[PDB]
A paper describes a structure:
Here we characterize a novel cystatin-type protease inhibitor, [name], from the [name] midgut. Cystatins are tight binding, reversible inhibitors of legumain and papain-like cysteine proteases. Recombinant [name] inhibited a number of [name] digestive cysteine cathepsins, with the greatest potency observed against cathepsin L isoforms, with which it co-localized in midgut digestive cells. [name] localized to both digestive cells and the gut lumen, where it targets cathepsin L isoforms and regulates their activity during trafficking and processing of host blood proteins.
The crystal structure of [name] was determined by molecular replacement using the structure of the tick cystatin OmC2 as a search model and refined using data to 1.55 Å resolution. The hexagonal prism crystal form contained two molecules in the asymmetric unit with a solvent content of about 57%. All protein residues could be modeled into a well-defined electron density map with the exception of the first nine residues, which formed a flexible N-terminus (Ser1 to Gly9), and the last two C-terminal residues (Asn118, Val119) of chain A. The final model consisted of two [name] molecules, chains A and B, containing 108 and 110 residues, respectively. The molecule adopts a typical cystatin fold (so called ‘hot dog’ fold) characterized by a five-stranded twisted antiparallel β-sheet wrapped around a central α-helix. [name] contains two conserved disulfide bridges connecting Cys69 with Cys82 and Cys93 with Cys113. The closest structural homolog of [name] was the salivary/gut cystatin OmC2 from the soft tick O. moubata with the highest sequence identity (53%) and lowest RMSD for Cα (0.86 Å), followed by salivary homologs iristatin (41% identity, 1.56 Å RMSD) from the hard tick [name] and sialostatins L1 (42%, 2.09 Å) and L2 (40%, 2.50 Å) from the hard tick I. scapularis. The interaction between family 2 cystatins and papain-type cysteine proteases is mediated by three regions, the N-terminal segment and two hairpin loops L1 and L2, which form a tripartite wedge-shaped edge that binds to the enzyme active site cleft. In [name], the first part of the binding site is formed by the N-terminal segment around Gly10, which is the first visible residue in the electron density map. The L1 loop (between β1 and β2) of [name] exposes the segment Gln51-Ile52-Val53-Ala54-Gly55 corresponding to the critical binding motif Gln-Xaa-Val-Xaa-Gly conserved in cystatins. The L2 loop (between β3 and β4) is characterized in [name] and other cystatins, except sialostatins, by the presence of a conservative Pro101-Trp102 segment.
Author numbering: 13 to 122
Write the structure that this text describes.
């Protein structure tokens, strides 16, 4: 069902930033996205995006009450710290976006 899409499309990069913004458990800092590696899509009820991207610790402390954004939450260092896959469910005609899954592994080539 999954159709490959162009991972340089900024619409897909912004969905990856949305996904990282939802991940707070066990952290002091938000992660942020370094690179979107892969995007696949499927239409089931809504429009679903399966994103694979690298992350690293951002400079944004979660408990400061800061809103996550790509601009503010820059990487502390340019080092890959995780490779993550996240599925996002959307209903474009209702402006709904929901992270269904988010899982990461450590980079095996650092």
């Amino acid at each position: 069902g999954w159709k490959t899409q162009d991972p340089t499309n900024p619409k897909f990069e912004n969905l990856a930033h949305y996904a990282v913004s939802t991940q707070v458990e066990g952290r002091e800092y938000y992660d942020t996205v370094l690179e979107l590696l892969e995007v696949q899509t499927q239409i089931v009820a809504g429009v679903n995006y399966k994103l694979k991207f690298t992350t690293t610790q951002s400079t944004c402390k979660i408990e400061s009450g800061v809103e996550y954004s790509k601009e503010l939450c820059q990487p502390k260092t340019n080092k890959v710290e995780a490779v993550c896959t996240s599925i996002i469910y959307t209903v474009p005609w209702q402006n709904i976006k929901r992270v269904l899954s988010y899982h990461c592994d450590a980079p095996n080539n650092v």
